Amino acid sequence: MITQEMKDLINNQLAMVATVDAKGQPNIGPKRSMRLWDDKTFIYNENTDGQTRINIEDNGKIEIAFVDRERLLGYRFVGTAEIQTEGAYYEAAKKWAQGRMGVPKAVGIIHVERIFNLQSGANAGK
Amino acid sequence: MITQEMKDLINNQLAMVATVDAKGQPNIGPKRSMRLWDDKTFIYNENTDGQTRINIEDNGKIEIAFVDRERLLGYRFVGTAEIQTEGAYYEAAKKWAQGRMGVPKAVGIIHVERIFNLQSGANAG
């Protein structure tokens, strides 16, 4: 679902993540550890329990955008998120962090459901 | 309440804008025209009838972020927003657009309530 063209941009740009709290306030922030798990899934290392973790545990809603500012290209990924503290995703996030950052409090997992282009704005699911 | 360092980042980086629709779904998109108006206000040129505009019109809630791709630097600005199609901001937005982009459909105005230093600073004001 995530194409090699998309992967290239993902691996060259910063993940910008939007979530929402209970009262409907959007929250935005970069996730510099955001990376692909497979062709339909992102993971990131959750180290702080900031608002993003709270929002995901509340309602699971999320959007991730990557933009190539220079070439005016990008992608928006829409899906469901969860937080895990045990299991395969978490242990992988733990190993990835070793020698790199602190031991993760949790791992965030994003299940991609729809993909949109960020020049056009059109659904790029084919 | 705006640092010169903040102004530098804002001028050199792309605003990413988060809003929410009437059903509570988040939306994120870039707005290259997002720019500081004064120390408590951003504006951007709205050239579309897209989701960011729809969401601002619905509930006014917004957060914007400017982040350096290559360095651990950036700022988050949280506040409320409105869309205008007439008045002084809109006239200013039209003048700004010439030689930069198309004639705007509207102007978005963001009233800053809180500032966050993103990767190294927590709150900044």
Numbering used by the authors:
A (entry chain B): 1 to 126
B (entry chain A): 1 to 125
Authors' text:
Next, HupZ was crystallized in the primitive orthorhombic space group of P212121, and the structure was refined to 1.7-Å resolution with one dimer in an asymmetric unit. In this new structure, six and seven additional C-terminal residues are present in Chains A and B, respectively, compared to the previous structure. The C-terminal region, including the His6-tag, still misses density for 39–40 residues. Comparing the structure of H111A to the wild-type structure, the two superimpose well with an r.m.s.d value of 0.99 Å over 237 Cα carbons, indicating site-directed mutagenesis did not induce an undesired global structural perturbation. His111, as shown in Figure 7, is located on the protein surface in the homodimeric structure. The ligand-free HupZ eluted at 18.0 mL, corresponding to a molecular weight of 36 kDa when compared to the calibration curve using the known molecular standards on the same column under the same separation conditions. The molecular weight of monomeric HupZ is 18.5 kDa, and thus it eluted as a dimer. In all experiments, the higher-order oligomeric states were observed only when heme was present, indicating that heme binding to HupZ induces oligomerization, resulting in higher-order structures. Our results indicate that each subunit of HupZ binds heme in a 1:1 ratio. Collectively, the rR data coupled with the UV–vis study indicated that the heme in the binary complex is in a six-coordinate, low-spin ferric state with at least one histidine as an axial ligand.
Hence, spy49_0662 was expressed with a 1.4 kDa C-terminal V5 epitope tag used for Western blotting followed by a His6-tag for immobilized metal ion affinity purification, and the resulting protein was coined as HupZ (heme utilization protein Z). The tagged HupZ is a small-sized protein previously shown to bind heme, and it exhibits a trace heme degrading activity in the presence of NADPH and cytochrome P450 reductase (CPR). This protein shares some protein sequence similarity to the members of the IsdG family. In summary, a comprehensive biochemical, spectroscopic, and structural characterization led us to propose that the observed heme binding in HupZ is through its His6-tag in a sandwiched di-heme complex from two subunits with an oxygen-derived bridging ligand.
